Amino acid sequence: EVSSKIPKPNPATAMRDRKPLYFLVDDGSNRQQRAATLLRNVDYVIEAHFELTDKAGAEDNAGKHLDIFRRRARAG
RNA sequence: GGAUUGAAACGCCAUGCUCAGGCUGGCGAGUGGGCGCCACUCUCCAA
């Protein structure tokens, strides 16, 4: 894996003088090795329900979104 | 259309099992034993 993220550029100066930008993965300490332990077979069932946000418009109704959700889930 | 301690993340670049060594030297299938004992082509048919 990699050691660090990328920095923000300045579009103006970048083009006004052609300059390459990149991150060099293979260089020195940039390379980092990480181990992991993980599950191998899973299955679950989830129970939940909706609730109205404060910014919601007056026309919004939870049941409508719930029906949309059921449609989408059935259709995959 | 904000936010699954999440969003991105190569095990990678390459190296001869090599050089060589006798299954050899040699040993008798060899000694010896009867196919023998004995038995009618014989009775009669002109040229």
TrEMBL record:
The chain holds residues 77 to 152 of 227 of the full protein. This is pre-crRNA processing endonuclease. It comes from the Bacteria. CRISPR (clustered regularly interspaced short palindromic repeat) is an adaptive immune system that provides protection against mobile genetic elements (viruses, transposable elements and conjugative plasmids). CRISPR clusters contain spacers, sequences complementary to antecedent mobile elements, and target invading nucleic acids. CRISPR clusters are transcribed and processed into CRISPR RNA (crRNA). Belongs to the CRISPR-associated protein Cas5 family. Subtype I-C/Dvulg subfamily.
